[PDB]
Design a protein around this ligand. Structure first.
Ligand SMILES: *[C@@H]1O[C@H](CO)[C@@H](O[C@@H]2O[C@H](CO)[C@@H](O[C@@H]3O[C@H](CO[C@H]4O[C@H](CO[C@H]5O[C@H](CO)[C@@H](O)[C@H](O)[C@@H]5O[C@H]5O[C@H](CO)[C@@H](O)[C@H](O)[C@@H]5O)[C@@H](O)[C@H](O[C@H]5O[C@H](CO)[C@@H](O)[C@H](O)[C@@H]5O)[C@@H]4O)[C@@H](O)[C@H](O[C@H]4O[C@H](CO)[C@@H](O)[C@H](O)[C@@H]4O[C@H]4O[C@H](CO)[C@@H](O)[C@H](O)[C@@H]4O[C@H]4O[C@H](CO)[C@@H](O)[C@H](O)[C@@H]4O)[C@@H]3O)[C@H](O)[C@H]2NC(C)=O)[C@H](O)[C@H]1NC(C)=O
Ligand SMILES: *[C@@H]1O[C@H](CO)[C@@H](O[C@@H]2O[C@H](CO)[C@@H](O[C@@H]3O[C@H](CO[C@H]4O[C@H](CO[C@H]5O[C@H](CO)[C@@H](O)[C@H](O)[C@@H]5O[C@H]5O[C@H](CO)[C@@H](O)[C@H](O)[C@@H]5O)[C@@H](O)[C@H](O[C@H]5O[C@H](CO)[C@@H](O)[C@H](O)[C@@H]5O)[C@@H]4O)[C@@H](O)[C@H](O[C@H]4O[C@H](CO)[C@@H](O)[C@H](O)[C@@H]4O[C@H]4O[C@H](CO)[C@@H](O)[C@H](O)[C@@H]4O[C@H]4O[C@H](CO)[C@@H](O)[C@H](O)[C@@H]4O)[C@@H]3O)[C@H](O)[C@H]2NC(C)=O)[C@H](O)[C@H]1NC(C)=O
Ligand SMILES: *[C@@H]1O[C@H](CO)[C@@H](O[C@@H]2O[C@H](CO)[C@@H](O[C@@H]3O[C@H](CO[C@H]4O[C@H](CO)[C@@H](O)[C@H](O[C@H]5O[C@H](CO)[C@@H](O)[C@H](O)[C@@H]5O)[C@@H]4O)[C@@H](O)[C@H](O[C@H]4O[C@H](CO)[C@@H](O)[C@H](O)[C@@H]4O[C@H]4O[C@H](CO)[C@@H](O)[C@H](O)[C@@H]4O)[C@@H]3O)[C@H](O)[C@H]2NC(C)=O)[C@H](O)[C@H]1NC(C)=O
Ligand SMILES: *[C@@H]1O[C@H](CO)[C@@H](O[C@@H]2O[C@H](CO)[C@@H](O[C@@H]3O[C@H](CO[C@H]4O[C@H](CO)[C@@H](O)[C@H](O[C@H]5O[C@H](CO)[C@@H](O)[C@H](O)[C@@H]5O)[C@@H]4O)[C@@H](O)[C@H](O[C@H]4O[C@H](CO)[C@@H](O)[C@H](O)[C@@H]4O[C@H]4O[C@H](CO)[C@@H](O)[C@H](O)[C@@H]4O)[C@@H]3O)[C@H](O)[C@H]2NC(C)=O)[C@H](O)[C@H]1NC(C)=O
Ligand SMILES: *[C@@H]1O[C@H](CO)[C@@H](O[C@@H]2O[C@H](CO)[C@@H](O)[C@H](O)[C@H]2NC(C)=O)[C@H](O)[C@H]1NC(C)=O
Ligand code: NAG
Ligand code: NAG
Ligand code: NAG
Ligand code: NAG
Ligand code: NAG
Ligand code: NAG
Ligand code: NAG
Ligand code: NAG
Ligand code: NAG
Ligand code: NAG
Ligand code: GLC
Ligand code: GLC
Ligand code: GLC
Ligand code: GLC
Ligand code: FRU
Ligand code: FRU
Lengths: 624, 624
């Protein structure tokens, strides 16, 4: 195995385990020390203000299995430290008949058992498990554990009657899934249900959703309410909160609802961030975020979605969440978004970015799989004075519109997402920052124009504001991770409303994914403006390319160029002319970002292991 | 619930959990502190000379499940002390995917991993498990753990390739079972295989048998050999050691071989005890002990058997154990005999005595189930100068015969069993001993004649030698646990050769078993004698009645009389006349025996618990 990145790549499948550990590896974001990771879990802000982040983890393997909670903490979402205990960086693992098949996703009750932070998680046991299989009751249950040492360790309740698991009965027959309990407080839901509590007897201050669906009949989000305040064993099923149809789609801006939900959460937001009012705040909007499966031809059959909802109270003392409008949380190779409350009226969301090596060709050579997205503040994005002539505006697909009294302008409301300011500040302050002169793209514009300052490695951020004519047919954007022979092109095409990432040339290594990524972006045209603007922020972090547009649209993807000098960046231009010009301003390169794991050495591999011939006998885990 | 034992029993099913804890409970033998126990396991003599005894254990339940090793130790087989650690008296429990369904029986490698005592045990996982079900490979595997603190705790090898489980591949298809690894050293087997080791490459000093069978085709004992001395991961399958037919029986003296073996062991004995020669000792005999299932209409479908075997070497470098003669280790309500080596050339055997409450009517009220037998020295019983006119002598069913040169006498060889002398000495020395005058049973003999001294409680031993005429039709024996209305009758009937325990009147409580127990006993008649003698030793210990005849025949059973004064004992006589007399001598009562668990209070119940509705969902354990 040759690791010469000045010449074409050889046959990299001949390379040893973890020989490509550092080659494509993110440095500026949350990632496990080694091995397999997937969904974020157990997220909470601790008593000292620091952030505890858990994740689905399988150390010393590069496929899923024996799934456990790995964990770390940070005071700023940005620089992290691993927990280190008797099981390394794991803090919860399969150990009991009820969870031996995997400690799946869970969420935090901050004041739980004996006043301690408490996780409610999906405890899995034996049997077929999956939305396309014939799962039975008991295979997925919900269990509690609590921590007396701020997340260094967790103590499970005992196995048995009146103890773990605490939720085991299926609320309906023939479920496609029954997992990912999301526990939350809600003055809103409490006020709505206050007149019906004699019907159900559930009066606790915590609610919990469980994600799933019904065979042949679409996805379901099931709502439970803690039966009694201060008591954590009894959870009363109220009813289905969200009910969608079998592979139902709200349209081109909304993905597809698939057959089964995963990692669903419930929040309430206003323009500033999180809202904890009882309904009295007329600027607040109720949201559900959720993954769907088997409604997509690619991206591992997975859509990470969100919906604004209007709650209705049922006669049986339950809640129907009626979808008002419906969007996409990230359009690329990410999934399993979790959100959690943060002090100062914030709700922060983070997901998992999978690799683009679906045939598992170089996973062993990597010695790891997966990373997080950046941490994102959620809020209600409000755009004022929108022109009624904005194309497609009254479809109200993933936004709402409200006319002015005179009908000459519109207020647009949608879900806002932006990178947490702590990370933006730390990234910029630790980088070599180059503020670039504005560039007018016209008839003289080359297809690709390198920036006047260049990155020095695969760890950088770009900002730019692209001003387009209202009837443009020009395309513009950013090329990143670029040499002569390898590059990744990020294009926006206002005429089609499509933001694309073209990866046909991303790498000389042919085994990685190369499909074109696509997001829809609505440029809301402002009354009196003679142009429309796209504000792009792009993070390049090893192999991760994470794109944010207008504090609204996110697209995470992967690129794995082999050559050491495929690190360049610049402007892309297509169909720009003397008449159809694209004005680029607010241009900035942040070279270096932050070393997110300062205590870790460059290579944190501990080698890879095989479970042996029993893995195929048990049939639960791949075994490697 | 009334506990008045001076009047007839009420409806005892109304009694609370463990309200009958002390009522019927043995005091003088090995028993768990509370809850369910079954098979002995992990038996070894520790470096300090003390005995470590493990047992299959399910605390705070009265049916089998989550099966674990409970443990205790003793310096004399008789007075015991519990281990106490983080899991109470447990020292190995289900904790890994490979053993989460139960830590089944295992045996000890005294110099194992890093020189420490090491257990090889059956690690069970999910799936149908049983001789009458369709079991698959992986459900039962064999795994290692070792102890650095003389049995207070055990450390399992890791899960994976080249680690646990160490034996997982089925040696043939469609096994009825694959469990109970019995590890042993054998100079005998080493010498037999020494010329064939190039064929298999297995040259280690430890052998292991695994108990099972083949669907439709009878039981099997599979032989493995440690591949390399001092290395414990690799065990090479040689071949089947014992092969028997589907419900094959060697006859009336030999039980039935059923469909599947359990808890099989291999030993070599001579007249003094254990033999460790390479074949050169012409007085030594090779034995296998084993349980069989589904060859019996009652006694939980279970026979605890033994066979003398002659080893033949196969061309493929394996061993066939050809059965020479075949007997019964205990004729009553016991099973799962384990044997282990003890210093001074001894092999000691101990089994499990189950209750006689098969419909589980009063188990919760007991708050426990099960005890051990007494510990027994095994040896080759040799009877010299046997008369050729002994009825049935040349059937050679569960014994061998060798004629003298002149044909006028015979030497009989069989398996000997006797209670370990440490226990006999301790019992006698701690008891109030009454030496009773000989009693001649003739025409004046009543049906029942109380002993001149009586027991004071349900903890005593009786000895007696019964001298019968060679053509007698009289019956005699012992009545125990006797008042006017409740009693248990132990009869021997030389004409039929049957030792019986009649339990039609054992208790006023009708829910307990009342079937007549039966053992065959051959009184080998001595040349020149005008009579034949039965030496009986009987232990009464709470509800256990354990009978030994002529250091050969054992019969364990249960009796649960309600009345406080059902403690008496005496002689039984039937058909004794002036001409057909039974001379009883060597009569002795030992009243009290030994307090076997001096540190335990009278009531060691910790209550009983229910696993809850998930027990039926998982389908592995009853749940209570
Ligand atoms: C099959 O068999 C399995 C094995 O038996 C079985 O699993 C076991 O289940 C039992 C029963 O559920 C579990 O027992 C519980 O344990 C909890 C503690 O768990 C943590 O700590 C233990 C012990 O840790 C010691 O030992 C280990 C090992 O050596 C060390 O590593 C530790 O450092 C520690 O060492 C010290 O102590 C030792 C002695 O104990 C010393 O020897 C040593 O020198 C040290 O000083 C760990 O073993 C646990 O690890 C395991 O589990 C974790 C997950 O939790 C895994 O990640 C890990 O890998 C291991 O598998 C773990 O870390 C106890 O809290 C719990 O006791 C409470 O509940 C019971 C039942 O309800 C009560 O009776 C009891 O009174 C306790 O409740 C009180 O306390 C809590 C809070 O403290 C209150 O919330 C509660 O209301 C109550 O309060 C009472 O007291 C108050 C006074 O303060 C009073 O105010 C109140 O009014 C009230 O009275 C219970 O003991 C056991 O852990 C499992 N073991 C394993 C290995 O899995 C399995 O379930 C079975 N399966 C089936 C299908 O049946
Ligand atoms: C799914 O995930 C699961 C969780 O990850 C996973 O289970 C885990 O598997 C791993 C991998 O197999 C297990 O790790 C092994 O652990 C063995 C020790 O096990 C005992 O001790 C641990 C740790 O005990 C500490 O912590 C607990 C908990 O707090 C305390 O109770 C203890 O008191 C103790 O505390 C002290 O130390 C702590 C830090 O560790 C401190 O924080 C603390 O303050 C104290 O000071 C226990 O947790 C174990 O309990 C569990 O398991 C038992 C059964 O064993 C259960 O009954 C119980 O309920 C628990 O479940 C247990 O008691 C290690 O020995 C082992 O390490 C050896 O092997 C590895 C791999 O081969 C080697 O890399 C390593 O070097 C070690 O080998 C060397 O040493 C041995 C002998 O010591 C030699 O034989 C060997 O040749 C080698 O020698 C080397 O060193 C020599 C120098 O001396 C040199 O001469 C040689 O040349 C050579 O170099 C390994 O770490 C882990 O225990 C499992 N955990 C659990 C909870 O189950 C599961 O498998 C996964 N499932 C699937 C399907 O994938
Ligand atoms: C004395 O010891 C016992 C442990 O042995 C302790 O716990 C009790 O254990 C018994 C089993 O021995 C449990 O009985 C079973 O209960 C089932 C119904 O449970 C629900 O109702 C009861 C009664 O109101 C409630 O107390 C339970 O509440 C507890 O459990 C829930 C979880 O569900 C917790 O949230 C609570 O906090 C409590 O812990 C329940 O709400 C019942 O289905 C089951 O019935 C089967 O068995 C009986 C008896 O054989 C039959 O009559 C019946 O027809 C069913 O038969 C089954 O038989 C076979 C084999 O199982 C199957 O194949 C059949 O199809 C059929 O299903 C049983 O009665 C009891 O619930 C439990 N009590 C607890 C935990 O409180 C006692 O506590 C202990 N006492 C003391 C004072 O310490
Ligand atoms: C680098 O990391 C790996 C962990 O990823 C470490 O361990 C190796 O891991 C790989 C899997 O990634 C193992 O490969 C598998 O090996 C199977 C055959 O094993 C036996 O032969 C090999 C080769 O001589 C021996 O080394 C093994 O010895 C070890 O295991 C035994 C227990 O069996 C122990 O006793 C020893 O001590 C050793 O620990 C074995 O004797 C093989 O069956 C399996 O093949 C499948 O997969 C490949 C690749 O995809 C296919 O080509 C093949 O057709 C099979 O495909 C399967 O694919 C699907 C999904 O699984 C199924 O549905 C199909 O039906 C089909 O079965 C695979 O090749 C490797 O054995 C293991 N090596 C070990 C433990 O030594 C490396 O050690 C590590 N390297 C370093 C230097 O650290
Ligand atoms: C019944 O027990 C008696 C008493 O132990 C046995 O007779 C004794 O046997 C020992 C050992 O061989 C001799 O040393 C004694 O001299 C014998 N005592 C006698 C005859 O009173 C007798 O062998 C046992 N019988 C059976 C059938 O097991
Ligand atoms: C790369 O090496 C593998 C062995 O890992 C081989 O099977 C494959 O065909 C090779 N690819 C080539 C020669 O293009
Ligand atoms: C309440 O009613 C809704 C709508 O019919 C139903 O889906 C839900 O299951 C009901 N809740 C119950 C039965 O607890
Ligand atoms: C909103 O404004 C547009 C443009 O003025 C108009 O076509 C539409 O009918 C208005 N909707 C309402 C509800 O008044
Ligand atoms: C660099 O990053 C660290 C870690 O996130 C941060 O705390 C620090 O403020 C940053 N340095 C700056 C902004 O100068
Ligand atoms: C980058 O490296 C390649 C391969 O070594 C080389 O051919 C090329 O000249 C270098 N520069 C660019 C911008 O491609
Ligand atoms: C004994 O009590 C049980 C309740 O535990 C009852 O069902 C049974 O019929 C009673 N037996 C009688 C009255 O003989
Ligand atoms: C050795 O031969 C015997 C008798 O045919 C057979 O049962 C056993 O399986 C063989 N051993 C092997 C194949 O290892
Ligand atoms: C053994 O002795 C009996 C009685 O003398 C005789 O019938 C039988 O044939 C003898 N057996 C042998 C092998 O000599
Ligand atoms: C009584 O029993 C104890 C415990 O087994 C034993 O050590 C002691 O020797 C016995 N006392 C005697 C024989 O006097
Ligand atoms: C034993 O107790 C019962 C019941 O109290 C009583 O009737 C009888 O007289 C007593 N004695 C005997 C030997 O049965
Ligand atoms: O099914 C009963 C209830 O369900 C619906 O959610 C309606 O909002 C409510 O008006 C109705 O009474
Ligand atoms: O930011 C702190 C927030 O988190 C807490 O978990 C509560 O649910 C919420 O009421 C509080 O405002
Ligand atoms: O199958 C081969 C071998 O098996 C048998 O056990 C015979 O004892 C032996 O003579 C024969 O050669
Ligand atoms: O009694 C001690 C005996 O036990 C040991 O485990 C050996 O297998 C045996 O050779 C030795 O004589
Ligand atoms: O690792 C298992 C976890 O991953 C998810 O499937 C989402 O990808 C969750 O639904 C589940 O809890
Ligand atoms: O508890 C399980 C154990 O009990 C037995 O079935 C014998 O009764 C063994 O074969 C097994 O190892």
């Amino acid at each position: 195995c040759s690791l010469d990145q000045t010449v074409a790549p050889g046959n990299l499948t001949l390379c040893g385990n973890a020989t490509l550990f550092t080659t494509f590896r993110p440095k500026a974001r949350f990632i496990a020390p080694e091995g397999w990771m997937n969904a974020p879990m157990g997220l909470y802000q601790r008593a000292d203000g620091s952030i505890h982040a858990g994740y689905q983890s399988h150390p010393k393997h590069i496929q899923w299995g024996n799934i456990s909670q790995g964990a770390a903490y940070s005071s700023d979402f940005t620089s992290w430290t691993d927990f280190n205990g008797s099981e390394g960086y794991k803090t919860i693992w399969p150990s009991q008949i009820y969870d031996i098949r995997g400690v799946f996703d869970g969420s935090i009750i901050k004041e739980g058992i004996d006043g301690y932070p408490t996780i409610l998680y999906t405890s899995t046991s034996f049997g077929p498990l999956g939305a396309t299989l014939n799962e039975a009751e008991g295979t997925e249950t919900q269990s509690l554990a609590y921590t007396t040492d701020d997340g260094a360790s967790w103590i499970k309740l005992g196995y048995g009657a009146g103890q773990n698991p605490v939720i085991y009965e299926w609320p309906e027959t023939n479920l496609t899934g029954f997992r990912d309990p999301y526990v939350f407080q809600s003055p809103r839901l409490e006020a709505l249900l206050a007149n019906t509590t004699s019907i159900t007897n559930a009066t606790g201050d915590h609610f919990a959703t469980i994600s799933g669906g019904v065979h042949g009949d679409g996805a379901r989000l099931f709502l439970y309410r803690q039966h009694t305040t201060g008591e954590f064993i009894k959870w009363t099923y109220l009813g289905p909160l969200v009910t969608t149809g079998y592979k139902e789609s709200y349209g081109e801006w909304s993905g597809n609802y698939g057959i089964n939900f995963e990692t669903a959460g419930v929040t309430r937001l206003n323009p500033a961030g999180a809202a904890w009012d009882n309904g009295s705040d007329t600027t607040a909007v109720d949201f559900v975020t959720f993954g769907t499966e088997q409604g997509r031809a690619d991206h591992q059959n997975h859509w990470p979605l969100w919906a604004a909802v209007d709650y209705e109270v049922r006669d049986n003392g339950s809640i129907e969440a009626v979808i008002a409008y419906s969007g996409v949380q990230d359009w690329g190779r990410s999934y399993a978004y979790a959100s959690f409350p943060v002090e100062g009226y914030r709700q922060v969301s983070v997901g998992w970015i999978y690799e683009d090596d679906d045939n598992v060709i170089l996973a062993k050579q990597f010695g790891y799989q997966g990373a997080f997205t950046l941490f994102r503040d959620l809020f209600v994005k409000v755009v004022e004075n929108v022109s009624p002539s904005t194309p497609g505006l009254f479809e109200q697909a993933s936004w709402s519109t409200k006319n002015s009294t005179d009908g000459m302008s519109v207020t647009v409301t949608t879900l806002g997402q932006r990178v947490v300011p702590e990370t933006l500040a730390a990234y910029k302050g630790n980088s070599t920052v180059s503020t670039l002169a504005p560039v007018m793209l016209n008839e003289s514009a080359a297809a690709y124009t390198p920036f006047s300052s260049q990155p020095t490695d695969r760890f950088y951020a770009l900002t730019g504001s692209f001003e387009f004519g209202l009837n443009t047919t020009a395309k513009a954007g950013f090329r990143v991770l670029a040499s002569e022979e390898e590059y990744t092109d990020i294009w926006f095409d206002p005429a089609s409303e499509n933001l694309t990432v073209v990866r046909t040339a991303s790498s000389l290594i042919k085994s990685f994914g190369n499909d074109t990524e696509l997001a829809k972006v609505k440029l809301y045209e402002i009354v009196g403006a003679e142009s429309k603007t796209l504000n792009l922020t792009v993070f390049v972090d090893g192999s991760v390319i994470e794109i944010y547009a207008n504090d609204e649209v996110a697209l995470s993807t992967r690129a794995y160029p082999w050559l050491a000098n495929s690190t360049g960046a610049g402007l892309l231009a297509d169909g720009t002319t003397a008449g159809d010009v694209v004005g680029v301003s607010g241009l900035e390169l942040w070279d270096g970002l932050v070393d997110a794991w300062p205590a870790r050495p460059a290579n944190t591999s501990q080698g890879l292991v095989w479970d042996g011939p029993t893995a195929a006998m048990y049939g639960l885990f791949a075994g490697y």
